Amino acid sequence: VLDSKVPTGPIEQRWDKHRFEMKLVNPANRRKYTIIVVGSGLAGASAAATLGEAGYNVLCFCYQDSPRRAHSIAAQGGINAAKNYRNDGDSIYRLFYDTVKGGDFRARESNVYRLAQVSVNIIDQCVAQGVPFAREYGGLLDNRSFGGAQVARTFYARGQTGQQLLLGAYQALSRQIAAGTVKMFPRTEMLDLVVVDGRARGIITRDMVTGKITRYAADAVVLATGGYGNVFYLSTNAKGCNATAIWRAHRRGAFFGNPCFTQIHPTCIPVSGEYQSKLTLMSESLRNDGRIWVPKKKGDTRRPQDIPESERDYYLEERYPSFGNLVPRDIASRAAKQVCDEGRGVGPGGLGVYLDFADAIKRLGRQKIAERYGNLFDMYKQITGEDPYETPMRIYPAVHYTMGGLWVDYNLQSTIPGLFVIGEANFSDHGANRLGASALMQGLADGYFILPYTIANFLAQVKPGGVSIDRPEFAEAEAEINQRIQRLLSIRGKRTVDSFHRELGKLMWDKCGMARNAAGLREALQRIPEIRAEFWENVNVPGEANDLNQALEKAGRVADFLELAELMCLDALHREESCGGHFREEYQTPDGEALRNDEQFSYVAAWEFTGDLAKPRLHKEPLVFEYVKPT
């Protein structure tokens, strides 16, 4: 059974009460414990630096060249905090209410309030570390609105806030490494989790430089491995992002919480062919001063600027006359996908819709528009090769975020004792929709002001050491990993790994995307095992195990994606309602907005791996709201 372990009493003092209730580890005894941290993103680096400062022996791992090469470095948007520096009604309670309402009432209130409460300390620590946030002329900090939020509570550092935050966290981690407290392992990836006596007591990893298989043993394991948005072939995250660690943890006994909750971004650059695998995330403000359209005739070979205004099928204006053409990203993205699938695409591959700024340029001033988004126009010109001022901008929405992940309690601990999941890899508290400029603050909160307390509380109840790497569990895990690698290398079929990845991504985008129905989900669930069998039968992975073979890593990631997609589709089919990112075509208001069923589906669905990829067990964690009532 799932125990949330949330505190009682008033919500304003629950975190302090829990902090007082939790046990502590003496500073002299801290050096006798070993903690493994998988991941060097914002959450991973912050947690590793804080635990090294505390005194624990920390082991950090990352498959990139350096910890600074991890993701969360491309987070262009700022970071939210309830500081009320702008004096416009912002507060901790206001931020908590906004976060819980934006999640469509699908997350615990205590976690949201704790995050909103620690956001101020997050900002203070980030400022003190030397992060160059934007300042006004008087020397104080500056704030801006996040394109729809009713308050200006976002702190930014030019257009690379995530880069500066990750640089600060990585500088702290490097300082800890120089002190000798934290040991860093770049260019290595976790391949299995070793559980001893019902506790996550180690990992099995493989460095890609030499292919050596290594076993590490520790008292606690933290999984800050990021999201799993790369299951879809086309996504806005890095090429190396995957779900291997979280899938292995779930297989070992961890519970997956709401895997079907995914968030998309409406404004992304459409690909120029099947070779491309990434879509660039521009911004959310480009639709404010733009009109989305598609030529009436699908075979219009003329230049888009020469197409008469009466000859353009201005969908999203003929349809949905309300909202002032400022429709939510869900409806606009669904309509764009529908009009692209009908064959009325505008890109080279038939994917994409036009977004002309000629009307905005004529109505407004060219200088004001250039100052409003000039870097974005320059980057679009660099990538596509067309000037946005004179040519309509082609856009196509893509998957951006995964709100789902491993289920964790109030102590950020998964079902497996001793295994903590922080950052993007857990369900956390975003619910069914992640608010803008909140993922970074959630990761920083988990790394800095949350994980140390819970991990100390857990470690104070156990004796340090006692488990070595010679135990039979480590040998069994290593043998399984070696057998899987040997099988993957010995298949030597015909199709490449990228072909299978693209096939799975297309199937998931078509069926398990933003628009989901029972028939499509059932068809995808039927099709997935055939694709998995074909991949395990006709894949071509060249090279050797003890070399720098990226194809082997891609094959492993694709196999994990194949295993995870079935569970994702099963969860999407199970949830018979529409909420947040998860949208069902048979449960919505006539206006197109999602319709909730708060008397049948007001819970969190944790999936238990029963050994069969088609029949995983379901557990329900009820959600009770006392301060913010559902609307």
Binding site: A128, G130, F133, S174
Partner: protein, 257 residues
Amino acid sequence: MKITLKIWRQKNRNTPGEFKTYVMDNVNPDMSFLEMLDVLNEDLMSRGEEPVAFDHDCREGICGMCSLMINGVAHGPKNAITTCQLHMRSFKDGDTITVEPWRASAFPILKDLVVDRSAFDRIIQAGGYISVSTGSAPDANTIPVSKVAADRAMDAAACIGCGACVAACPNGSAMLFTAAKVTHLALLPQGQPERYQRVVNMVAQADFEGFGNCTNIGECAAVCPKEISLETIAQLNRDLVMAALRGIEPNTPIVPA
């Protein structure tokens, strides 16, 4: 577009490498250089040869993991861009394109186009930070910072750590990277208490890592993707001179594990 390519191919660190020629018949001008390399790797895998290995994570010019020297100029002929940002709409039909990794004593070669850049991490570890513990931070608006200083610090701090400055510098020096970090950490008040030590440590670490000296030639700024000006180096120099006046001595070097 028909492109002839000369790829540097090396089996491992110990095995000597050599140039290998390949021909691509249909290349879309819109696709990027890394997309063409992926297409060529797929073609090689279909033919049965070993695919070319290269570093690429973000494909957006922010992570800095990508590292390639194209036609003798790092990050392609175009300036102020990274390798992933380079598209072949700027190349010419029938051209011959030569690709090599970074060549430096501090950047060992691991594969055809993959190099080890942990020396930058070791340089950063040698005092290139601010020693502030978690939870002891004061209020954010406690110390005011002028807008000009903040803007200059942001300009100097926007370094992706690609290492193109080391490969482009004829001396193979890491002066631009260290100078950018020192300038970023020295223009803010929070970095004031330990700046004069910091630079020396960082400089010493560079000399310990195997990087060369700076002749003030200027290839670093002309090749750096983020357009970091040479003045940062001057700033570093000034700090070092001041650190020399006060008798600051460098600490022990950071020995790799």
